[model samples]
Target chain A: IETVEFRVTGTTRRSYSDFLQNLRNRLSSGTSVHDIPLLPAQSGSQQDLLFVRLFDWGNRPITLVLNRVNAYVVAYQAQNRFYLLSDTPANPQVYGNNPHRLTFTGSYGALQNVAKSNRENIDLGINPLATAITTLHNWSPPTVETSVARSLIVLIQLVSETARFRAIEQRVTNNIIDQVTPIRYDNFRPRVGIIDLQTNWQTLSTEVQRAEGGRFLQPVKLQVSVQQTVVISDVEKARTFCGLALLLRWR
Target chain B: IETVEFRVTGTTRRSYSDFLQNLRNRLSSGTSVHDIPLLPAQSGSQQDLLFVRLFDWGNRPITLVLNRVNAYVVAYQAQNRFYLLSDTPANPQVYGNNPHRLTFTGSYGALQNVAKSNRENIDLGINPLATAITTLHNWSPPTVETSVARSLIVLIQLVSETARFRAIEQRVTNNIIDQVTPIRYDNFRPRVGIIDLQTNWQTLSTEVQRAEGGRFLQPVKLQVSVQQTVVISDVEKARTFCGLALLLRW
Candidate 1:
């Protein structure tokens, strides 16, 4: 049976929040509201080990709202909770000695789908040493480095690029995530008596271990669930999901 | 540094006598007339492993001279010392179920290469299936299954595909691989260094205590080498290779 389905930009956890806030903020401060949620790739999931993403209409570096998280938690409850332990996003900004350029070194390799899973097709073997050349000559402490790496504008460019990378990532997810239904499928039947996506990506790291002399080290397990809201028998709605296991264990 | 280097094309350990004699006769009759000694892949200082690579006109299966190696020792130098040992060609084919179709399986996922070393991406899981499929289907064996498994034409088909895939993989290594080479120079190199490619893939089913739940019967590690050859630097002309790593676990 063929049924027509209109494709609206899907919103994932953070992307949905960012898009909605971005949209509401834009429309609130005397701005004309046209087509909202902008592009399909306007947001994506911003992976955070330390900092939780805070949404602001304008780029405000640090402005903690009253009871910052309580309001957020009430507004959007799906996002993971992160402690405000850092006054500044003090994560070390890696840099190298080459002046007018900043570079970070690390190991990387690719792995094929070892088994049938939602997450598959991973880009392994480091970004082939993505030289994050930038012009920002200096950085604040707590964001300490081996030494002050210089990149003219490259450092700032890449630091912002990285931040921007995180930003666009959120956008992409906002655009592609499946729309949430008003009634949560809390009582939905279990497919394989398996875990959900949250538990899967979350518990993955501690599960797979890369032996000392092992050839590959999986840092993060990626899961891309292939779902078709409706079923079409015989034409098995198969999704080519393979675990693109990624892990980074290096200095 | 575009330099002319001999590439390894073929590799098979010979324990059979007939094939060994045939190989000895062929080597003597070939263009290179000197009775080049067929020594153990690993000799005192020699690059222990045998690397039969493919050059401009040397990629096809070659009749490697016969030599006996056991317990990591090279044996024999005189005439007809091969004895009753069987002659196993470098490219031994073994087919599963589809011997006639000439399909073999190994644990390989995608055909590939990583550096000038020609890194054919090896999957610990599927590549073995591919290796087993191709090898079993094409290799000449003692039984009907064995005979059908060792089909050369089938071997050719698998090799061509694997090799072509290697070619495709080379394209990727040429571009992005270098961009990141400088940062982590010795950490990650796309070099497939197989101490033993045709390592027999074996499985010994046994009962073991499961960490998560009840008693489980599955595979466990046995006598397997934990050492690995890493891609330190393509500049150092690191040796690159590809083949099967059939590890046996109890």
Candidate 2:
């Protein structure tokens, strides 16, 4: 009968004009930089730059290219695959841009690998932008603290009292409807455990019998208990430790 | 760049045979009970019972009825609406049960009210089943402890260094892609906020000028900071408190 709820909240702040002005000044100063391109070139000018620079699990370089096709359309290239995003919808007379097309030239396996690596990095608490800013500014990032909590509720009733409550414990625990699929954050481990056992018992409710021949009363009792386990930790360590403790305790 | 992750886990246990046995004994005792009924009655003996009993916001009673149609089909009634559930799929010959028909007789408004009340009770940390069991057995339920945590990371960069990072702070804060629809549990309150502002500054990266002035560079710096606010509280109070503090602070 216990209830559970989860909540998340946050706020973010940023300055756009300041960043643009600083970049304009830097470019005006003729400062030579790698992986950075000049913005707002001539009408016909096209710029090719590295949008996202990353490495695979093997430390091999993998990059996403940003190609400014025109004033309206920007193409993002991952190897041979191109994801074109436009400010205006594709219209022949208006922009002469190709209609939105869904296509990926790269192998699905390769794309999956890139996505997997990105997700893993996130899980590992690696923020590339934050790291770069911290290094450039020589400022240490603040430490983050995590908290975990859990609640479990079990309801027991006599079958004679309420047919629905009969074997309530067993019915509640054995029911798999509430079981959830293991999520990625949980490292694919079940987080909850339900157990049930049956035994014989005598009670006044079962002692008295009807004079006429009829079905005899039964002598039994039910007990159902639930335990909810929670885990809070870094990705890798949590995954490894979670796999063992939750399963072991339940078994 | 910091990553945020949330995880949940738990287990439950119950005994079916013991419950059924106890119920059978009590029925044989011929003790008249108001709501309790005998199981496995004779063929053609249909039984009607209350499946769920609840009280609405105005304290008006609301109830769901369970009707056993046959060996395989059971119908749940809510006002005029009937949700028929069967152990076997509907077929012409298999069980003579009607093919799965999708129909609801109750008004949407009424149903919504019932659902809303049930949800509100849950959010308030009220568990009807647990309360019933505790009362009947004269036992006390264990206390539950709750914990909350949050993480925030902001990245700043010069426009000259990376066009993407030029107005990085503003861009990051202004982007609404990450905004999520408020869920029912949150009492329909925006749980996150993003703010942005523009400013001018003097720095080495933006001080120089080109001789052939085709285009002049801009002089600006970016500051993007993100603070994640988290709230842990009981239902009604949390909803009211959440609406004020999170919005006021941001």
Candidate 3:
């Protein structure tokens, strides 16, 4: 039997600041990732800020935030793990804008260029070593790469399974507290969406073996593939949903 | 036949700022009430800053705003007449926090205290004088009052009947814009309640003939008594509902 736990709270939406601060604290813990950068939040003197700007992680300096512009992004390294990031608009040509286009390229810093240019800034991850193992069994693979090797591994492992668990919990708490004492209602009961996604899980030549002081090791890269159908309903009862292509069209 | 019209909007909640700003702009016109104070929204560095402090309105200090807090209060005044605010909590004791406690008071105010004290805050309105004008109308007498006039006589006039209409229109726009580019979900398609209300149309003590500087005059306050029950169903189909109390607990 499988078990699941769920909690719902009505928080005023402006307190995404609180959510950001707490997420930064959790991600900053050196155990998983070091110095998770805080999202840039500048409440401009009473002007109507149309949209939150996205942080450029690859081209500019590497910031601690997972994706600064989006509300929250948590990354944990470990085997037997999965990462899914859907932070891009639907179209690129007609309406193209993504911050971290350069640095986040696949292993060779090249594969992601096409996808990002097309306006699907997706980041998907899976543990090769973990996938090689069975449901009831666990084992570690060798560092050496060979055609006979059973797995294609991405060197980075996830932080702990509990990392994502904690981040989501913090978001839930933010929703409740802000609802009781709201200053802003921008993000309250937000209808979330996966938008569009693409993963660079497998693409040879993109992988490279680097030499660091005569010691040669093959560097691993990540790839993702997501195929899920999202469903949306009326706003009164089912307030949040993944997709709404039928009701309204999107680029 | 005398007629009155009203409209309500249930916006997906992210656009509360837009709602506040629009409401502020209209309220600032200085036609109905002068200088409605703005609700303070500067979230301090600390988290959980529970209430949006409302600027006190004594005399000269005027701002354009709504309730201006996380609690109950909606003042609709005209000269000497003040329509007491009666937005409720649908609960009491456990979550007892109301801002305009001093300014708004009446029997209608009485109906709201219990609701406002509850968790779900609801703001309801009524037009008492309008109701009494019908055939075979009901009556409630007052103290030391020399038998007041008839309904058509009581119906002096309206304080810009367009006032409430404009406010609600602005609210409708807020909800629509937010539906397009939403920041959050909590208030998306919110269920508004205009629960129970009564105007001070005939209440004696609450109504007064005051001496301003040197001259004296009688003031008439506006009251709204709405009678309607809203229904909501079919989640995937039609989404937004004007008001809901039965489907989901207020």
Candidate 4:
């Protein structure tokens, strides 16, 4: 990802041998480069070319065709629209008097033109940072940070097929209606008994405290009522369904 | 905020000096502590006291009063309700077989009782992390990360006091209405001209490119219309007002 392919074309002050030595010496003092293929200048060239191949922070390939004459970037090619460097003057006192100070003139005309001309290949204009920030905001749970934290109390009723325990067991093999509907059969009737399923307050409190580093208060006791018309065929299956129902309701 | 004040009051296996030496040896390899004051156990003690003073991550002060008997945390106190330590056993093979492994039972009864008994001093229960996350989400700009980025176009109208240039200068001395209102005075009249005020595209484009690192597209050219009723009064003041109005609108 840190690899940068550099080549000088057209003309330069130093000879090819001297330039290579100088380049090697300069690079040695800074970060290590993976490769440096120094090519000879092209014959009869109009302008000096400082060809550079590098990767952006996002690991996207970037090609820079720089003009050595005025230090102006002639061409810039990248996966996305690239900002062209400008030689705008700045106060050395404020910016610090660095000899090798390079200024980027916030111009996107070159990239904009590229995107405009090749609309099929390149996107016109996009801000990945803004997109990411927006994505994070949208993806985050809305109620997670609410001032008035509210809990949704879900009441899941698991209706048994019949009042007889034997009949309820047989109903599990058959296609039992999970959805709420009007009681049609004679045996289908509401039961007065209510089964309560609750999360262990101690376990929840411990988990929350450990996860939040004692920052969050222990959660209050929460229970979901699962009313069974008759004896449930499978208590575990019914419990799982009740949990799923609570999750579905929250979503 | 990483300060813990601990004191053991009741009976324990090791003497005060031995306990201090062991604690010092244990803490030396890890984080450095500011202070350690080991007090002797009180006479006629029923249960061992494992007193702890510490600060939460939020830099809030905290104090923990633990019971060394049966390794159960009898009482816990902090700036907020703290979770007490439980002696629930875990599978050693699964939990790495750590002999000193302590478990915390999810029970807030003691803290709940404390809060209930003294409601005025401590807040019942609060989640700072949740609150902070919520604050960050809310504080962020809504349009910053939208799929369809929208630009606001603002139009400002700086009405001059009079049509005559001489009368316009005198209007600066008197109060002029900045807000949008109906034309009532005789001198007030609409002009057949419109002035365009726009941000320098070069500068704005340059800024956006630099700030976004070529991730965002260059902003399209935007202009604000500042219609002058008459060619009179201070141009700079009107321009400032127009800028303010543009800011006000968008």
Candidate 5:
């Protein structure tokens, strides 16, 4: 299933060195930062730093970690896998803060291996040829010129299949993963809505390819579409390509 | 109330400098590390490593971030006090790590005075004393001990009182900002746990007292005992001590 990732900024006013200075100051003044009466001494580790800094989220004026930018990455993989799309907040153009398109994958990149072990579990074979099916897109959001033709093909399949799938009692629900894997399912129109979605089998497939290079069959995707807008309240359905995915919002 | 942080043994390879020299040497030749592709240049703010080593959690190497740490921290606060004990697995004494007692307090550091025009609905306050709580512990699974004096004062009084203000009949849970002037609860149980924790509050207070050289209530801790042993499924759960946490693991 497709997951939404939120990117934000984080920081530490000072570096680990600043922490050392404050600690040293505390160590002096007859006050051993490490030997506080109740506090046990590493005695040996006394020289090792006892504290560190990480982005914390509780206190407000929220001690917003400043400095480095952070992006929350959440995947929508589920037991059944049938899930749908979500619209994102109008965020600033963030391309991994300007990382290269190639950063997305590597030899041992996202695809980890393709030995006898991965032959069944992987998305591609031992090696992959660059192709639309293999799914290689720049970090930037798809531009009409670059994305239209291929995206249009999938969109058409979705729209056309909506009726065909629905006629067979399949409702396009939020479950994209469930529709995938050819899993046996029980119909709860809830899972199949006019807004039924299947996560980006393409992107998922790409990561799998990077992890295993090319090994087995590509991940299967549910291509059902509903003419109606998404049913979920959180989704803010809008037009894409002036006509595609005009039915989903974000949580 | 409390949270533990987790970190893996950073590249055991020599330090960052040596690692880079190794990279340049490999590039000097034509051979490539058939693993992860060397990604391209960095953009604004996206830190292209002074040195970046990917700790690939190999195939079938399940990466589980135990959420148990969150629950363990909460348990420590319920007891009202905690101690962070430490010791390396291989060593016990001398070279071994030792455990330290811990205490916590949530003191809003300061008040940022803003003019009427600048003020917003939520009366804003400044925490001049805001400090990074993470600095209290080591990065590796350093051993840490935590304790909180168990007492009925908190449960009998604070719980019921808090419950009165926040019941199922009452849709909203009572929060600190909304409490009456005497916010100190039946036994001064900080509504939240970890954030309320301070690194060596006793030690810091002692120093503060010495500096002021005045006599006052020396941080009265409630009379109590506690349950020992916290079940921490995740490695990160080990960071419950205020200001300082244990990083060493079994």
Candidate 6:
């Protein structure tokens, strides 16, 4: 099945009147609709916070009309991982005076013309920098003050240019998420059960206290739920798969 | 294709004056207009939110001047997973107490000697701590402090050491992105259509209620529409491909 379903179960007492009304107005007024963030109306359900994505099987799409879903299925499935690393320096000042034009004050160093493996490749680090000071006047400079930092963008281009990753499509749902589903077919009859969820509050408290240095302050708790729509034969079947255990393994 | 097309076809009573003018000013004022966010002007089109990017087939750049579009295809796409698990302790206080000193009070655990074939990988779990407390000082001091807080900054360095996503060159059309030309012709004329969009509103309410908790707050609704702009052979052919079923398939 190319269909992936999302089962948003549980309960939250939030209001969507304003949100929905605005949405309706936008659509009516010809808004260019895009990705709809599928989140539950309320919080605190066994399936509390995992964002499960439902995908269309083939190139074309299938229209799905969902409502008050304690459960939904992502019919067809495939999975891939994308790694995005942002070089966000803690200090904005580190970027220097101009983010566009880069300039550095340095005298000189050895300019190697060739490498040992360099039966071919040339060494431009020293000579390149020296030449760059003049020729690279308009080039974008790097933030922070390290040679490695300055040359990072160039290095990034070196690495990312020919890079590629593999996309492995998940064939079926395992019991891991299957266990969170509200509807269960028992001899063809639908059986509904409650999905109990919990969070690690202890570690959170300890870390908080440590940061506070024993100083007492108000306690505030914000709920975070990472939900996912998955496919699984049943809870029992999903248990047999170990690849997904780490997702919930750590405290 | 000099035309380099986008699948945004429609109208919206939205204002791009501030945003557009601001963009032009920045670019004109020496701001390097690089990664332009290709989003729809006003939200709610199925193709509304998801920014499916259109690209130039060859390396040469193409300039597209877009107006009144909540825009944007892709080529040679691949992905990888990078997990940076940081074990950084929280308390901002942990970084302090003594700006240059981390004096942890404890005796510590089992000390392992020798290597796996007496070969490698040292264990500093306990002995290291002991030595660290005594020898360690002048570490980067703490910055801030608060209570019952938890945070860890894990520096994740995956295979993407120098990985960079491609920024396909985009040219211009001045003020209006009025174009779409194919690099090659495998076409039987050109055709385009609207991909219907929908979203569930119930769960949204439930989510808000949970976060803010029960209250007599006025309810709100947000419109969502997920759409796509696909270059098909033609509407007639595309229709022949489907049974008018998925347009309402269960």
Ranking, lDDT, top scorer first: 4, 3, 1, 2, 5, 6
**TM-score versus the correct structure, for each prediction:** 0.21, 0.15, 0.22, 0.14, 0.16, 0.13
* Ranking of models by TM-score: 3, 1, 5, 2, 4, 6
lDDT of each residue in A40-100, candidate 6, tens digit only:
3333232222222222112221111111121111111112211111221122232223232
The sequence of per-residue lDDT tens digits that candidate 2 reaches over residues B79-136 is: 3333333232233332134333223222222222423422212211112322221222
Give the distance in Å from residue B12's predicted Cα in candidate 6 to where it truly belongs: 12
Question: Each model: TM-score of chain B?
Answer: 0.17, 0.20, 0.20, 0.19, 0.16, 0.14
How many Å off is the CA of A99 in candidate 5? 33
Model 4, residue A12: distance off in Å is 69
Worst lDDT 10-window in candidate 3 chain A: A242-251
- Over A1-251, each residue of candidate 2 has an lDDT whose tens digit, in order, gives 01111111110111111222222222221211110111232333223221332232233322222222211113222233333332323324322343332222222233224234212122111123222222212211131101000000000111111111111111111221111232011111111111111111112112112111322243222221132122212221111111100000000
Total clashing pairs for each candidate: 94, 36, 48, 9, 63, 103
Native A-B contact fraction in model 1: 0.00
Estimate candidate 5's alpha-carbon lDDT, on a 0 to 1 scale. 0.19
Model 6 chain B lowest lDDT segment of ten: B153-162
Q: What DockQ does predicted model 3 obtain? A: 0.02
Residue pairs clashing in model 4 are A86-A105, A106-B206, A202-B106, A206-B106, B3-B54, B4-B53, B5-B53, B6-B51, B7-B51
**Between candidates 2 and 3, which one is better according to lDDT?**
3
Better of 4 and 6 by lDDT: 4
| Superposed model 2: Cα runs more than 4 Å off | A1-251, B1-42, B67-250
The stretch of ten residues in a row with the least summed lDDT in candidate 4 chain B is: B148-157
lDDT of 4 by residue, B165-200 (tens): 111211221111111132111111111111111122
DockQ of each: 0.01, 0.01, 0.02, 0.01, 0.01, 0.01
Best by DockQ: 3
User: Model 3: runs farther than 4 Å from truth?
Assistant: A1-236, A239-251, B1-15, B18-70, B78-80, B85-250
